Design a binder for this molecule. Structure first.
Ligand code: HEM
Ligand code: HEM
Ligand code: HEM
Ligand code: HEM
Lengths: 146, 282, 146
């Protein structure tokens, strides 16, 4: 990874405008809708029968806050992502059994959600910076898989 | 497949795109070049600076083809046939790159269509672009009669060993690509495990059935397509890893039969099986 | 890159038995037959229309010697693959314009050829070690792309 100073500022600048709880639920919701095989982890969440059931599901919204708050905290440690996420990586492999391919999917759905939310403000260079960060987070969450 | 609902969603969305389709096309390429710089390797002959006429022209041509596709969504292979030939025989872009442009077109539409880019429309557009990409890469290599003959010859030679080779293929997969183990948390994965031997034989038997029905695989494999799409829910990328490991297994057991031409035929057959098993995922 | 003592021992022992001349041409030939769009980089090699034409093509064999030779010298520096391949990384990007995805494809075909050539000796744990190495070499060759 390793970002230039201008890429860091761009990531940081836009992130100050994000409602973490809303965007977290929206990105998780669209993951489950657009790539329905990811629903395999969330059978206890209840009704996921249509996109509205999903987007309106309170357990989806709560998990949205959870994952994106950990993400947000990781933006403060862009120089030590592997170290910041080591325990989470171990958990997702050993206990949760999450195929790391899911982290890349969610990363790309988050980028779509940001573009939807910020429109013209989400410029090609700002996207490029975010693409690096989500790949970095995916890689760091996959790091302890064995 | 694109549901009838999907088709309705794409038409609505692309109609909104309207006379901006070209501009959005040029934007999607600019986003791709910046986010995924390896894609620039296919454009060394282009000025790739922002707003270049070459990029704009590319965006417009690509946009016209998508419009064409949308207007003929129930006949895409035929509508894009000239374009599939051209990418397969002249341009020869590696298929992975289609996923990358599709993602950047999705980002572009999201950024320009606030009102229309709902979760369901997002879903439909993604499926549509995957369908276009499939069509555009379809002639890169249907199994020819030579492929069919080669696959029956090699699999006939596997014979009664089919099960043992399936087990070995999974063991190779689990060691080489540890992430695949996430789908078997309930298994003893040690070497020699009877659970892995049982998995191997079931997959082997299914492949034997697919060879026997090489011209009617969607129906012969329909119950398994259902099971993986709706219950097991294995990410499609994993099918490519198992296919590589079955090829390695066959190579190590069939020295005389695993010729370059038979290897190519087997790789095409496993990709087709893989396509059929993931065909009802979405 | 990091390999257990067992992994590096497995890689080293097998490689002592590899005829670099022959295995290199076999691997490149099968790449061209199995993934024919890769032929886009070798238009001057002449006739590659049929498998037999590909496998007996003299320029294919000669180039085979070339790339696997550099691969073999890589195996002497498994702890610094990026520094080892830096110059060739640059060359493949800036001069040859090769999509890094091809490095992964060639990696996998090489593994297929090792299995074919060595049979039962190419055990699951030895394959596993070679898959790490080919992925590390692909990553090293793509490192300087921009
Ligand atoms: C960058 C992406 C991700 C981050 C930062 C993240 C983060 C987290 C966090 C902070 C937890 C809670 C850990 C604890 O209980 O101590 C969690 C749990 C979980 N995550 Fe992840 N996660 C990510 C992606 C994913 C994806 C893509 C999936 C599956 C499609 C997933 C599935 C789960 C599941 C099933 C749980 C357990 C929830 C529960 O037990 O209520 N995660 N995640
Ligand atoms: C939705 C996917 C795509 C569509 C609909 C599409 C369509 C087209 C069309 C219509 C042309 C021009 C045909 C002509 O002028 O004869 C073209 C050219 C080309 N395409 Fe594709 N394309 C797609 C994806 C890609 C991807 C992913 C890449 C590479 C990253 C790519 C690279 C090229 C190249 C190198 C050319 C030639 C440009 C020139 O030299 O003028 N295409 N494409
Ligand atoms: C083209 C390759 C494949 C074929 C033909 C195939 C076929 C099968 C068959 C025949 C079954 C058993 C269904 C029954 O009980 O009747 C099965 C189960 C299963 N498959 Fe697939 N499969 C393939 C690929 C994969 C891959 C790549 C994975 C995951 C990495 C996978 C994961 C599973 C799982 C987890 C089960 C159930 C195991 C259990 O708990 O008993 N399959 N598959
Ligand atoms: C294990 C990965 C690879 C290694 C270590 C490698 C190494 C090399 C080396 C040492 C050269 C010689 C340069 C010179 O002396 O002019 C070369 C050239 C070349 N490589 Fe790579 N290569 C690899 C993979 C690939 C792949 C996958 C492709 C394309 C599909 C490719 C295409 C080329 C081309 C087109 C040339 C020039 C041939 C010529 O000038 O006749 N390489 N490579």
């Amino acid at each position: 990874m390793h970002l230039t100073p201008e890429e860091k500022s761009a990531v940081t600048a836009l992130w100050g405008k994000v409602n973490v709880d809303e965007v977290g639920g929206e990105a998780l919701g669209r993951l489950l809708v657009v790539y329905p095989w990811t629903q395999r982890f969330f059978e206890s969440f209840g009704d996921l029968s249509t996109p509205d059931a999903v987007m309106g599901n309170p357990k989806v919204k709560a998990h949205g806050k959870k994952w994106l708050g950990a993400f947000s905290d990781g933006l403060a440690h862009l120089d030590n992502l592997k170290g910041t996420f080591a325990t989470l990586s171990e958990l997702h492999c050993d206990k949760l059994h999450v195929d790391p391919e899911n982290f890349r999917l969610l990363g790309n759905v988050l980028v779509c959600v940001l573009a939807h939310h910020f429109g013209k403000e989400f410029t090609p260079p700002v996207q490029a910076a975010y693409q690096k960060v989500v790949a970095g987070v995916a890689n760091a969450l996959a790091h302890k898989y064995h | 497949m694109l549901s009838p609902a999907d088709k309705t969603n794409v038409k609505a969305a692309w109609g909104k795109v309207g006379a901006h389709a070209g501009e959005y096309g040029a934007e999607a390429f600019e986003r791709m070049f910046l986010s995924f710089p390896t894609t620039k390797t296919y454009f060394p002959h282009f000025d790739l600076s922002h707003g270049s006429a070459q990029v704009k022209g590319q965006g417009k041509k690509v946009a016209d083809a998508l419009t064409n596709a949308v207007a003929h969504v129930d006949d895409m292979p035929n509508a894009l046939s000239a374009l599939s030939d051209l990418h397969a025989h002249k341009l020869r872009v590696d298929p992975v790159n289609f996923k990358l442009l599709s993602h950047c077109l999705l980002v572009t539409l999201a950024a320009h269509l606030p009102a229309e880019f709902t979760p369901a429309v997002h879903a439909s557009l993604d499926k549509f672009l995957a369908s276009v990409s499939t069509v555009l890469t379809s002639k890169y290599r249907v199994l020819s009669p030579a492929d069919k003959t080669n696959v029956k010859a090699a699999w006939g030679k596997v014979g009664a060993h089919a099960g043992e080779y399936g087990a070995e293929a999974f063991e190779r997969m689990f060691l080489s690509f540890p992430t695949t183990k996430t789908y078997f948390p309930h298994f003893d994965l040690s070497h020699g495990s009877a659970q892995v031997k049982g998995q191997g034989k079931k997959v082997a038997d299914a492949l034997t059935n697919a060879v026997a029905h090489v011209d009617d695989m969607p129906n012969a494999l329909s119950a398994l397509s259902d099971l993986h799409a709706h219950k097991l829910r294995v990410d499609p990328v994993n099918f490519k890893l198992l296919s590589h490991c079955l090829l390695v297994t066959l190579a190590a057991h069939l020295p005389a039969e695993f010729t370059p031409a038979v290897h190519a035929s087997l790789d095409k057959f496993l990709a087709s099986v893989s396509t059929v098993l993931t065909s009802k995922y979405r």
